[PDB]
From a paper:
The outer membrane (OM) of Gram-negative bacteria is a protective barrier generated by lipopolysaccharide (LPS), a complex glycolipid that makes up the outer leaflet of the OM. Following its synthesis and transport from the inner membrane, LPS is inserted into the OM by LptDE, an OM protein complex essential for most Gram-negative bacteria. Several copies of LptA link LptBCFG to LptDE in the OM, forming a protein bridge spanning the periplasmic space that functions as an ATP hydrolysis-driven conveyor belt for LPS molecules. Once they arrive at the LptDE complex, the LPS molecules are inserted into the outer leaflet of the OM via a process for which the details are not clear, but which must involve a separation of the first (S1) and last (S26) β-strands of the LptD barrel at the front of the complex to allow the translocating LPS molecule to move laterally into the OM from the lumen of the LptDE complex.
Here, we report the generation and cryo-EM structure determination of a complex between Shigella flexneri LptDE (SfLptDE; >99% sequence identity with E. coli LptDE) and the RBP of the BASEL collection phage Oekolampad (bas018), which has LptD as terminal receptor. Oekolampad RBP (RBPoeko) binds to the extracellular face of an LptDE complex in which the LptD barrel has dramatically expanded at the front to form a wide channel connecting the periplasmic space to the extracellular environment. The monomeric particle class gave maps to ~2.8 Å resolution and showed clear density for RBPOeko bound to the extracellular face of LptDE. RBPOeko inserts deeply into the LptDE lumen with a total interface area of almost 1,700 Å2 as analyzed via PISA, with a complex formation significance score (CSS) of 1.00. RBPOeko forms 20 hydrogen bonds and two salt bridges with LptD and two hydrogen bonds with LptE, one of which is between main-chain atoms. Most polar interactions of RBPOeko are with LptD EL3-5 and EL11. A superposition of LptDE structures shows that RBPOeko could not bind to the crystallized, “resting state” LptDE complex due extensive overlaps. As may be expected from the insertion of an additional β-strand, the “laterally open” LptD barrel is much wider at the front of the complex, with strands β1-β12 and EL1-EL5 displaced outward by up to 7 Å. As a result, the pronounced dent in the closed barrel between strands 5-10 has disappeared in the open state, and the barrel is almost rectangular in shape. As a result of the conformational changes, the open state has a wide channel connecting the periplasmic space to the extracellular environment with a minimum diameter of ~10 Å, wide enough to allow passage of hydrophilic LPS moieties.
Residue numbers in the entry:
A (entry chain C): 22 to 115, 139 to 208, 232 to 321
B (entry chain B): 19 to 25, 29 to 168
C (entry chain A): 198 to 208, 225 to 760, 764 to 784
Write the structure that this text describes.
């Protein structure tokens, strides 16, 4: 168990190409913890009278020597430049504390705005749904459906929100992927885990990625539809991206 | 070598042009080509009947796939434009001529408004190359005419 | 994967001959046409098309008429309920699928022209699901277009408009002209010169509400001076280009880009061209008596000034690809939004061989372009292997030898020094006795550097596009008797050492029926996970009812993804 201290929270675009620098005071000998709430951003790029969807996701996090952090990312195809918008919360293991200001088992029917602003954690049990988070709302979709329609779904979950009443304490971090990983009896952070480009129904079908929790195992699943671009104009290679940024896991003591 | 400056057959310096679509893109190209060569074009209803007549026939344009990528997607196209025509020498018989133009290009993904401007330029250039071929076949008609 | 097809059917007002169809994708389908002679200038065709997988009948209605206004055709396909659509598209409450198509053409007097091209669909997935006979889609949208024209020998005036049918589930970007006016006027023999005027007024509207809009007016007066001789000719041309833009809806684009668009933009620039040409000839008696060889040098100088066009959005201009004949072209983009500067001279030589009948047999062409100044269009972003900008950069070639009345050979090369190697090249040799006997050889090449400079940026990173093209093909055809015919084609990729296409067809023709069997193994996609291609095997059984002739060739040869083309 760890008790990180709140430092700041950012929601802004990168200053330079795929690089977002956030300045904040830091102390020597401290483990900086960054909880990305918006690690992905599908930017439309212009290439010679073509408007092309292109996910931009964070790749690595670097500490700027006791003065801040920087986030460096990349696009799906490694060919286009842009300024993506990323959000998160910067903390420090070594002085305000985030407090549990919301804890309720809720019923989310397709979408639900957060009752109180903060960093949401949740756990549920359903294999046919996926849960995402765009910053203000929780998005629940039908992940077992193969098509270009934005088919919603419902799920019962335990929702906990921390903002800056028990202190925020976490025990492990997890890198989500295409294979199941058991998190035990614990709550996982809610966010988009990547983006998908697919050849589906004569379109370049673009979706976001969410979290699938069946039992206690978590992996990546398809989520909210971003857009459909006709393949009569241009055709894109298929992409399925899971971000390398870790997600926080907190004990189920809230 | 024994080169020397070259010295349309002189019997076709005045001729009638019939196309069925005199305001079309092919006939406009042909008239321009029979203007740089000092040929006077007479109206279709000339009282004179001792002049040859060039009658433009059917024109066919075919575009097909020439290459594919490793996913089977179309890489290159090939367009073939065929033009038919006949020249009538009064007293003599009918001498058909034809042209065949080839053009290869890559299938470039573009917005369809920008992409048909590129296709409308390729076809316009293939009309000028087809008109030039029909003028180079006039000396061979005069040779056939003189059995 | 494997697929199979089985078709049977044909090649006063009553029923026609029905045709059936079974495939291992859509199962049984049946067509039952009926014909109706309404009048000498009216008729209809009702064709209930029963689809088994969709579990209902699509009523395909057709109406061809010819009235005083003109001749038109209308179409209305209607499927009362779709079973597959309910599973695949649950967000739609209904399942009705329909398509309305209207065409028209009317020539009042001999100069006026009228046209209509109207299309509507019910859902954004109608075109993908159905093999509609009528109806045209542009970038996935059903388009409605109207046109009025007026054409005499020396004047043109066309006004037209085109619209898209956009659904809320479609994100594709497309511009249309609502409306567009084009005017042409030619007056030659103005003294020693020829004159010509071109004008256009257009309004651009995008399918999306966040893309810029503009109104553009263009004027282009031209004056020539064509001088000709028995051995040479030179043509001097002067041109003027005047354009005006009125751009709105620039808020979304300006905030996301460093280069801002401007409200009012005036682009005014001249153009000067000098094209020369000479022809020599020689009596080629050292090869064969009575032959002639001609040598035809050609040079052209073009000058266009430089205007900064970064504050204009690019609506309808795309880069043009070049061949030998494109070395003398005076435009780099197709459209009126990008007009690159030019300070260059093009030189070329073509040599021909004529036989004793004054019939051309052989010709070869070589050409290049020398740039005195780099061609800039303001918005200059092209990936090149080298930073060279001036000098001799482009080379192109041509060849056409007519070996006999049945043998033919062709070729074409392109050599760019900004890539340091061969850009593109193609060749072809064919023997063709008659319609049923032919053997052909192919080769198509495209360097990896050429694709990086030309194709979109994501091509150079994907393994299915980044390696270029290197393809060898072979087509053959042979009839066994007066009622048999065999065809075959094999295409190979020497970069990957894997085939690209393979076809084999046999047809037995008879007096009253023909039976055709086909097989094709083709590239039909990628894996995206294991990074390898996916092949598709298909067998086709086809029975034709005859009331025709033909041994089946030239139809079997054009059935694969790389169709045969007569290159003789």
């Amino acid at each position: 168990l760890r008790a990180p201290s709140y430092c700041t929270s950012f929601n802004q675009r990168a200053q330079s190409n795929k690089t977002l620098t956030i300045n904040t005071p830091l102390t020597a000998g401290s483990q900086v913890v960054v909880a990305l709430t918006r690690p992905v951003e599908v930017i439309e790029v212009f290439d010679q009278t073509l408007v092309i969807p292109d996910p931009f996701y964070v790749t690595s996090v670097t500490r700027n020597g006791n003065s801040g952090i920087t986030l460096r990312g990349d696009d799906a195809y490694g060919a286009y430049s842009g300024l993506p918008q990323w959000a998160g919360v910067i903390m420090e293991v070594l002085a305000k504390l985030m407090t549990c200001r919301y804890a309720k088992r809720v019923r989310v029917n397709g979408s639900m705005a957060l009752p109180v602003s903060g960093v949401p954690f949740a756990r549920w049990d359903d294999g046919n749904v996926s849960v995402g988070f765009d910053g203000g709302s929780i998005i629940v979709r039908n992940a077992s459906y193969g098509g270009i329609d934005d088919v919603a779904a419902s799920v019962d979950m335990d929702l906990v929100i921390f903002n800056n009443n028990k202190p925020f304490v976490y025990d492990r971090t997890i890198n989500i992927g295409t294979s199941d990983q058991n998190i035990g009896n614990s709550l996982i952070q809610l966010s988009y885990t990547g983006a998908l480009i697919q050849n589906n129904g004569g379109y370049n079908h673009v979706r976001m990625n969410g979290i699938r929790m069946a039992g206690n195992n978590v992996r990546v699943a398809k989520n909210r539809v971003i857009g459909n671009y006709s393949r009569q104009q241009f055709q894109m290679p298929g992409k399925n991206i899971a971000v390398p940024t870790p997600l926080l896991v907190i004990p189920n003591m809230y | 070598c024994g080169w020397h400056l070259r010295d349309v057959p002189s019997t076709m310096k005045v001729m009638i042009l019939d196309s069925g679509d005199p305001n079309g893109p092919l006939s406009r190209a042909v008239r321009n080509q029979l203007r740089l060569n000092g040929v006077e074009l007479l109206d279709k209803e000339t009282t004179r009947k001792d002049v040859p007549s060039l009658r433009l026939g059917k024109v066919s344009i075919a575009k097909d796939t020439a290459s594919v990528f490793r996913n089977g997607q179309t890489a290159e196209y090939q367009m073939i434009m065929t033009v038919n025509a006949t020249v009538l020498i009064p007293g003599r018989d009918i001498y058909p001529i034809s042209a065949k133009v080839f053009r290869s290009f890559f299938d470039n993904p573009q917005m369809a408004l920008a992409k048909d401007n590129e296709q409308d330029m390729i076809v316009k250039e293939m009309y000028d190359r087809a008109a030039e071929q029909l003028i180079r076949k006039l000396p061979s008609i005069r040779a056939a005419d003189i059995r | 994967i494997w697929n199979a097809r089985f078709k049977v059917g044909p090649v006063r007002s009553g029923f026609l001959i029905p045709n059936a169809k079974y495939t291992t994708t859509n199962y049984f389908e049946f067509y039952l046409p009926y014909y109706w002679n309404i009048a000498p200038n009216m008729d209809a065709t009702i064709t209930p098309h029963y689809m088994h997988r969709r579990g209902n009948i699509m009523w395909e209605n057709e109406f061809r008429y010819l009235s005083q206004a003109g001749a038109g055709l209308m179409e209305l396909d209607y499927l009362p309920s779709d079973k597959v659509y309910e599973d695949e598209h649950p967000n739609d409450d209904s399942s009705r699928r329909w398509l309305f198509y209207w065409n028209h053409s009317g020539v009042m007097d001999q100069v006026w022209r009228f046209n209509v091209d109207y299309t509507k669909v019910s859902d954004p997935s109608y075109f993908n699901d159905f093999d509609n006979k009528y109806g045209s889609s542009t970038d996935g949208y059903a388009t409605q277009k109207f046109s009025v024209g007026y054409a005499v020998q020396n004047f043109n005036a066309t006004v037209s408009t085109k619209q898209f049918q956009v659904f809320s589930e479609q994100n594709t970007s497309s511009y249309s002209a609502e409306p567009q006016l084009d005017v042409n006027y030619y007056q030659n023999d103005v003294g020693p010169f020829d004159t010509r005027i071109y004008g256009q007024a257009v309004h651009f509207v995008n399918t999306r509400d966040d893309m810029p809009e503009a109104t553009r007016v263009h004027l282009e007066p031209t004056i020539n001076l064509p001088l000709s001789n028995n051995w040479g000719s030179i043509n001097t041309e002067a041109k003027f280009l005047a354009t005006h833009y009125q751009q709105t809806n620039l808020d979304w684009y300006n905030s996301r880009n460093t280069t801002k668009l401007d409200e009012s933009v005036n682009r005014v620039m001249p153009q000067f061209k000098v094209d020369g040409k000479m022809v020599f000839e020689r009596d080629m008696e050292m090869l064969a008596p009575g032959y002639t060889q001609t040598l035809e040098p050609r040079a052209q100088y073009l000058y266009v000034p430089y205007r900064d066009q970064s504050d204009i959005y690019n609506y309808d201009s795309s880069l043009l690809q070049s061949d030998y004949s494109g070395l003398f072209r005076d435009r780099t983009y197709g459209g009126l939004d990008r007009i690159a500067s030019a300070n260059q001279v093009t030189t070329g030589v073509t040599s021909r061989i004529y036989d004793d009948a004054a019939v051309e047999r052989f010709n070869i062409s070589v050409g290049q372009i020398y740039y005195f100044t780099e061609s800039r269009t303001g918005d200059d972003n092209i990936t090149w292997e080298n930073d060279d900008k001036t000098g001799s950069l482009v080379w192109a070639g041509d060849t056409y030898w007519r070996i006999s009345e049945r043998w033919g050979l062709r070729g074409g090369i392109q050599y760019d020094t900004r890539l340091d190697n061969v850009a593109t090249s193609n060749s072809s040799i064919e023997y063709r006795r008659d319609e049923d006997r032919l053997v052909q050889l192919n080769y198509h090449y495209a360097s990896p550097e050429y694709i990086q400079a030309t194709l979109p940026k994501y091509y150079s990173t994907a393994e299915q596009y980044k390696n270029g093209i290197s393809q060898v093909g072979a087509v053959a055809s042979r009839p066994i008797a007066d009622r048999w015919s065999i065809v075959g084609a094999y295409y190979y990729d020497t970069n990957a050492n894997k085939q690209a296409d393979s076809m084999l067809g046999v047809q037995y023709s008879s007096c009253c029926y023909a039976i055709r069997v086909g097989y094709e193994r083709k590239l039909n996609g990628w894996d995206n996970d294991k990074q390898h291609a996916v092949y598709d095997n298909a067998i086709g059984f086809n029975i034709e009812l005859r009331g025709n002739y033909g041994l089946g060739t030239q139809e079997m040869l054009r059935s694969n993804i790389l169709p045969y083309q007569n290159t003789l």
